[PDB]
Amino acid sequence: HWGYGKHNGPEHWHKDFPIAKGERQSPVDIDTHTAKYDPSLKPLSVSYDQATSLRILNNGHAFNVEFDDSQDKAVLKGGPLDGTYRLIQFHFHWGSLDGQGSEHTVDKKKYAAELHLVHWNTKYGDFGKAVQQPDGLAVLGIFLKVGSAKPGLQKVVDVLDSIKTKGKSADFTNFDPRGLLPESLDYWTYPGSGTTPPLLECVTWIVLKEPISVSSEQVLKFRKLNFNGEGEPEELMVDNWRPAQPLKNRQIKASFK
Numbered sequence: 001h002w003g004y005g006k007h008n009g010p011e012h013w014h015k016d017f018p019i020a021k022g023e024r025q026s027p028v029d030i031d032t033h034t035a036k037y038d039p040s041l042k043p044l045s046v047s048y049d050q051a052t053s054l055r056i057l058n059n060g061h062a063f064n065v066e067f068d069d070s071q072d073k074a075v076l077k078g079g080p081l082d083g084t085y086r087l088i089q090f091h092f093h094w095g096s097l098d099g100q101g102s103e104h105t106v107d108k109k110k111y112a113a114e115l116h117l118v119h120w121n122t123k124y125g126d127f128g129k130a131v132q133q134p135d136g137l138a139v140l141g142i143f144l145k146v147g148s149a150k151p152g153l154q155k156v157v158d159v160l161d162s163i164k165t166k167g168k169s170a171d172f173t174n175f176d177p178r179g180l181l182p183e184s185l186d187y188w189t190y191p192g193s194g195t196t197p198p199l200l201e202c203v204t205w206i207v208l209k210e211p212i213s214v215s216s217e218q219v220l221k222f223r224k225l226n227f228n229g230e231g232e233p234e235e236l237m238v239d240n241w242r243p244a245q246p247l248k249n250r251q252i253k254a255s256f257k
């Protein structure tokens with residue numbers, strides 16, 4: 001099955017998921033000189049004060065911090081979006097080394113990691129329905145660079161020991177995702193896809209320009225997770241990122257000059 005090794009990595013995925021060579025795949029390189037400022041873009045509205053985290057799960061490809069999305073509690077709206085999108089989960093993609101790990105790139109620059117806050121359009125009733133629609137998901141992407149620690153990330157880093165291997169979960173209540181946001185909500189936006197199989201073309205991407213800083217110790221702890229199940233040969237969970245895909249007939253818009 002798919003993953004991130006020599007044999008089942010991104011260059012293989014098209015054989016089970018032909019959409020991998022489609023017209024609106026993600027990630028992409030953000031060429032900052034080609035992106036057009038769009039003064040009609042609104043400020044993003046991130047309303048996370050009522051967010052209800054529940055659980056953290058190692059799914060064999062990353063870890064997902066899951067939220068209660070049975071009511072409008074943590075929502076994204078505004079920006080390029082019409083309507084209201086509910087937070088369902090966040091996860092990260094990261095590298096074996098600080099010089100790689102992000103999925104989007106900025107003028108070909110790779111960051112150490114990238115956070116994806118996944119939200120689904122409430123007009124479609126459920127996440128499973130929303131992923132079948134071209135405007136079903138909105139993913140807020142935030143880059144991570146290694147420098148100062150991110151205090152709001154430390155509760156995530158400290159639970160990782162308890163979900164080392166694939167299929168492990170742990171209770172993860174009362175986590176406030178506002179502590180993962182940078183100061184500025186200036187963003188780039190474009191239409192694309194999920195970056196793991198099934199690679200559905202249902203995502204409005206909103207990528208924040210300002211990274212967050214995490215410490216070397218914080219990202220080292222991500223790198224101690226395992227892709228394998230318990231009792232299986234250890235394969236460290238690193239380099240769980242898809243590289244940049246062709247932009248094709250798309251334009252990346254900037255909310256700022």
Ligand SMILES: O[n+]1ccccc1S
Nearest residue numbers: 116118139194195196
């Ligand atoms: O990687 N990924 C997994 C699930 C949903 C979105 C994304 S970006």
Ligand SMILES: [Zn+2]
Nearest residue numbers: 091093116195
């Ligand atoms: Zn992702």
